[PDB]
């Protein structure tokens, strides 16, 4: 039973429904290629992202806006979820809220291929 | 014989205890020799129609 | 895109992507050969998670000598031009949410199908 | 259930399941074994060594990635047993009786890979080939139940079902019935040939057998024996 | 006999209605009920109708 | 009916031509084919006579018919001396059948 | 709770056709007792009277 | 309730046949034998499978849907409860001829008419007076014994006239009718 204001409008009625549901990554989530782009700033892929940013395999994850957004995530707390769920061993270097394609990048640093398989599981 | 005591008690065990049980967990079931088991003191007053 | 299995070449059994630790390179070595293959993808894994599915790919040109199937008249073919279509649904599990329908050309060496 | 045509051996079930979660393991329930083998060693106790070839009779269209990684973390899992013998002696290790040696192993895990799983496509000295087929076709149709690209099956259409009426309801006691009296008159042969006489077989058919095993369970109803009627 | 009528037509108009229903959704407008999926919100508005 | 008279006429000559041959010191052979079948009789201190469903009826009799099969014995020893002392229409049992099939009176 | 179900492939009785959602086809009985019902849907009247 | 169950009128129950005459005549059309088989050719050709034995692959199996029918609606080499069933979408060709499989006879339509004319009704009203009985009409071609694996793909009209006249089109491609 809803409190304050938010018991009348259904706009802040429906933060609380999502402050409530439980959404892991994978509701958000829509391709997961592991790449093993050995140079970082190489990037097997067209994203001129890295380079302003700056282990050769990384974990490029495009997320989904329409599922992004219906539950009003930025990448700020994906990334920082990101790092606090699996400490420093880890570097996500995410996208802006700018661009088309809501892409996440990680990369380990510090039997190894198959560790990004692992933790993405 | 000090050996076959063992096995003659444990044939006494088997029926001393199927008289008052006579369905165990892993144990062959008492029955008589026209082939149906038999209704042992727990099974006179187990369920309904104990 | 994806992944094949691409197998050996000297025992034919299936070949593991393996980083090259010295020119950084992938590699694709065996395990009961010691056959290297050098990878051209430089992709290892790929996961849809929407599983973003055409069902244009799955729908056999078969399907139109089919009794069971209803026929329309109002949707030609594109490549022939024959008036007769058949359609169905996705006909699938895991059908998301969509009941779209799909249409074969009901001619003989066409099998075009398509979506509206 | 994979049954021959009224055999005295009975039906037959195989398990081709896959397990829930690395994730996706296909497994398979063999009968006469206690656990469970995964599937790419029975293609090699079958005798399939490279794994192109298992898998040309699991995939028949090499050509979409889609089901290709679907069964790569099976084939990952048993890269261990590599030749047939190897393979033998894993499904050989589990029977119900299992060998002391490891030949008597392969001789088993030989012997259910010829008569036990899948009789119905043959029970013969040379049959893998098609037990391959047949197995490889149980596999894929999992998979296709696994992308979802195809229904599953339900357990109450009537075509899944068949009725036994009157003469196969008969033909299941006249086989027992016919093992019993053989069971009969061989202690009467072993009897008689033991005390180095001769032996008759007038007398060592017991013609009541079949004639009151027929007519018990016509008689009473339970389909069985009246030693073992509840 | 005029109650006749009135039921053949009710039941004409509705038979009619469920068949727009069915267009719409094969062409892709019926727009699910924001808490259903596509084949509940369908059959909702079927079975209201 | 059907389903009977295919027991009857099939199923019962493939039960018994496929059951292996038992062997046992020397060991014989003792094989078993070509089953026939009769109508149901009575008293095969009485003389064989049909029995008629309503006579098996009423004195709570069992409307049956008794099975014979042909089998050859091979008793095979040393200095290979073997007689296939063949067993005709030995009885095997009574085998119950089913009103107003083929083999009902 | 449901319509009637697809129980042969997609399809509720072997006279409709594949994918067929419309009333007559899922069950809706349109006729009354007294002037019958059609064979279809004597057979999905007993289903939902079972 | 539920469990024990009632025959309809018209059902009857497979009694069950060999099927060694019907893997002899599928080895002498095109088939291909599962044993001299390339692995690469599975991909486009129907998968014979004939009880419940994957034996054979076919590449036209429209061919043989229409022999094999042809075959039993004379009563030859297929008997007249043999099943054979084409499933289009995946590609597969079940033929069963074992015991227990429980069907029914339906008349059988060819473009929109039936196969029934007012012959066979007429010889079999003077049955009885000579000779004429149902076994004519199933060997002369006119019903057939549908079942309820093979029932899944007919598409089967209610009544001959109401259901396979002229209006907006329901289907127009009837192929059985029911008694
Ligand atoms: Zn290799
Ligand atoms: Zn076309």
Redesign the pocket.
Known sequence: FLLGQSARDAERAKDILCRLEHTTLRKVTANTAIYYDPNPQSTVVAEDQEWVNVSPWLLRVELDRKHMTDRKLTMEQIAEKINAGFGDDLNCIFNDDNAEKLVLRIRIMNDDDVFLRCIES | AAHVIAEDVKLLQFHVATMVDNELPGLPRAMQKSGRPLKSLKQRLKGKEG | GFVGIRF??????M?YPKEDKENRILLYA??????QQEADNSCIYVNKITHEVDELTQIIADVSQDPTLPRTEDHPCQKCGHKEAVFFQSHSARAEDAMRLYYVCTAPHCGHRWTE | RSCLENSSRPTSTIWVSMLARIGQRIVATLPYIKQEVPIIIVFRALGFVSDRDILEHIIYDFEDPEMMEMVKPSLDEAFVIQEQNVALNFIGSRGAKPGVTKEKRIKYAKEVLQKEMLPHVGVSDFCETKKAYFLGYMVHRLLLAALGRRELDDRDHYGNKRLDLAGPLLAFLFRGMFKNLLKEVRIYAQKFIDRGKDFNLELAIKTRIISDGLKYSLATGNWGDQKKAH | SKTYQDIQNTIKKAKQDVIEVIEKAHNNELEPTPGNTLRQTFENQVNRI | LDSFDEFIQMSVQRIVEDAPPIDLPPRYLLKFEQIYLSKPTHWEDGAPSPMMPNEARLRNLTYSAPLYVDITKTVIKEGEEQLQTQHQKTFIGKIPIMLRSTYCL | GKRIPFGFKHRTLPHFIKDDYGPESRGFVENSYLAGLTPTEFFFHAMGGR | VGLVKNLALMAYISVGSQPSPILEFLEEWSMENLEEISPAAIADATKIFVNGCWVGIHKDPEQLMNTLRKLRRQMDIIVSEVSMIRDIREREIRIYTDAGRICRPLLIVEKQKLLLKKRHIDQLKEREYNNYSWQDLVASGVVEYIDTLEEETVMLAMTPDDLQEKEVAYCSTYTHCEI
């Not at chain 3, 050996?8 to 059994?13: G, I, L, M, S």
């Not at chain 3, 065996?30 to 056959?35: A, K, T, V």
């Open positions: 050996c070449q000297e025992c034919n059994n070949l065996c395990r009961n050969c010691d056959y």
